[PDB]
Amino acid sequence: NAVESTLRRVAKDLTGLRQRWALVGGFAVSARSEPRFTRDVDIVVAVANDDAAESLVRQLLTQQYHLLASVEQDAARRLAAVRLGATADTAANVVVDLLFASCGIEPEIAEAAEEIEILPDLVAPVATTAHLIAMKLLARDDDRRPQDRSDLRALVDAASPQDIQDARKAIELITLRGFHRDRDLAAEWTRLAAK
């Protein structure tokens, strides 16, 4: 409700700014598999560099958002993501996460995303099932994020064989770019799948 209002708002704001963007997170998993409880908006935004990301964040802070946190890292792309606090709606305050260089394949995710009617009269770009599988494998944390393991099950159960292969190729690109850190994500996937 308030979450849905925030989604519509950030959707219209990013598109008006001509940003290459895609929904990830709960709305996207819900769209690709089984609707599940979602209380924030998670978006990938493909931009050229940190300077472009910061220019976009300053543009949003002139509108109905305030900055709650920045995620910075030692990589060539120092700005990984920002967390914004939305005030589109008035029942409760709602978080909006913008991901720039968090998983390392933000450009490919925005490019492969597909237009889907998420809400009545809201068509938004949604990450592919394969890209969501890759993202959830990377982000899985059972002490801090137990929804990831369940989301991953739902996504794999909803995927086609080609989706699975696309996910494995998405994992290799993440790894080629160093975003795996020290982890063999494909081997982790195999072991989770054995159950």
Residue numbers in the entry: 2 to 196
Relevant lines from the article:
Members of the MenAT family of TA systems in M. tuberculosis encode a toxin with a conserved nucleotidyltransferase (NTase)-like protein domain (DUF1814) and a cognate antitoxin, which can belong to different protein families. We show that MenAT1 can function as a bona fide TA system in vivo in its native host M. tuberculosis. Furthermore, the toxin MenT1 acts as a tRNA NTase in vitro, which transfers CMPs to the 3ʹ end of tRNA acceptor stems without preference for specific tRNAs. MenT1 biochemical activity was fully inhibited by purified MenA1.
